[PDB]
A = this chain, B = another copy of it.
């Protein structure tokens, strides 16, 4: 009966599945659930494990160089994730690549471009932080730590290794969402795409746009996973996209496709498919006005990435 905990923490316990000497833990599988699902299949139920059951669990963790876009799906149930590590992973999913490269370089006095187990522990705790009423009345090892630093914690973590860990995690979650809609096929429909974007938006706007795609001319092909992932990378750098659309000033004008494509490239480095861009415009234009309005688009997308996970 805990009214004493914050929103995020409440959630963590809600999905967590392991208790070991009093502490709670997600599995890898629980974490993917936590960032894909609204509520768990089994809520607030902790299987208790021995210190050894846990060690044993851990000893079959792959080394960092066998990491992949399928690390978590492969580990599934047999692994441990701390609540701090949960917030760390959420940061890797939601925030832009920049802050990580900066903070890692900042902690790499000793390295170089390598980090110690202890340095990583502190760096990760940093990311976590980010009277009148009287008057009225009167450390434990986890999959990530073994993965990054080996079994007795003595390895050092290269920056490029860790950076591709970040990429892998991002691609895993994206693949899971994309599969959700594709049931294994190569592409997804305009409607699938739209539903993914608008899924976390006010149901008024979602009404208009979804009926726009359902009523519109049929698509010729679908969105590959690559166009999908490109688009969500762009969602990580939405801030600079807005920034860039500002100096392409001045009247909050509306953007055409070649315009919008150029804007994406310049502000983020990514070169969208002509097809991906066209698909954006079919979702959102609603013939307003054969060109897209950037500040409406920025609004819904602002919402989508943050509250999607």
A interface, CB within 8 angstroms of B: 99, 102-103, 105-106, 109, 126-127, 129-130, 243-244, 247-250, 258, 262-263, 266-267
Q: A99-B247, A247-B99 are in contact. Are A262 and B106 (CB under 8 A)?
A: yes
Within the complex, the shortest CB–CB distance from A260 to chain B, in Å, comes to: 11
Contact A262 B129 (CB under 8 A): no
> Inside 8 A of A103's CB, which chain B residues have their CB?
247-248
> Inside 8 A of A106's CB, which chain B residues have their CB?
244, 247-248, 262-263, 266
Bound Cα distance A174, B273 (Å): 45
Contact A250 B130 (CB under 8 A): yes
Contact of A267 among B102, B126, B127, B130 (CB under 8 A): B102
Contact B262 A105 (CB under 8 A): yes
Bound Cα distance A244, B102 (Å): 6
Name which residue of chain B comes closest to A125, CB basis.
B250
Contact B247 A129 (CB under 8 A): no
Bound Cα distance A249, B129 (Å): 9
Name which residue of chain B comes closest to A250, CB basis.
B129
> Inside 8 A of A102's CB, which chain B residues have their CB?
243-244, 247-248, 266-267
Name which residue of chain B comes closest to A105, CB basis.
B266
Bound Cα distance A109, B257 (Å): 13
Contact B250 A109 (CB under 8 A): no
Name which residue of chain B comes closest to A246, CB basis.
B130
Bound Cα distance A99, B247 (Å): 7
Bound Cα distance A248, B267 (Å): 25
Within the complex, the shortest CB–CB distance from A130 to chain B, in Å, comes to: 5
Name which residue of chain B comes closest to A107, CB basis.
B248
Name which residue of chain B comes closest to A258, CB basis.
B109
Name which residue of chain B comes closest to A262, CB basis.
B106
Q: A102-B244, A244-B102 are in contact. Are A249 and B109 (CB under 8 A)?
A: no
27 contacts between A and B (CB under 8 A): A99-B243, A99-B247, A102-B243, A102-B244, A102-B247, A102-B248, A102-B266, A102-B267, A103-B247, A103-B248, A105-B262, A105-B266, A106-B244, A106-B247, A106-B262, A106-B263, A106-B266, A109-B258, A126-B247, A126-B248, A126-B249, A127-B249, A129-B249, A129-B250, A130-B247, A130-B249, A130-B250
Bound Cα distance A105, B99 (Å): 25
Within the complex, the shortest CB–CB distance from A157 to chain B, in Å, comes to: 18
Contact of A126 among B105, B250, B262, B263 (CB under 8 A): B250
Bound Cα distance A267, B102 (Å): 7
A103-B248, A129-B250 known; 14 new pairs, CB 8 Å cut-off, are A99-B243, A102-B247, A102-B248, A105-B266, A106-B247, A106-B248, A106-B262, A106-B266, A109-B258, A126-B248, A126-B250, A129-B249, A130-B247, A130-B250
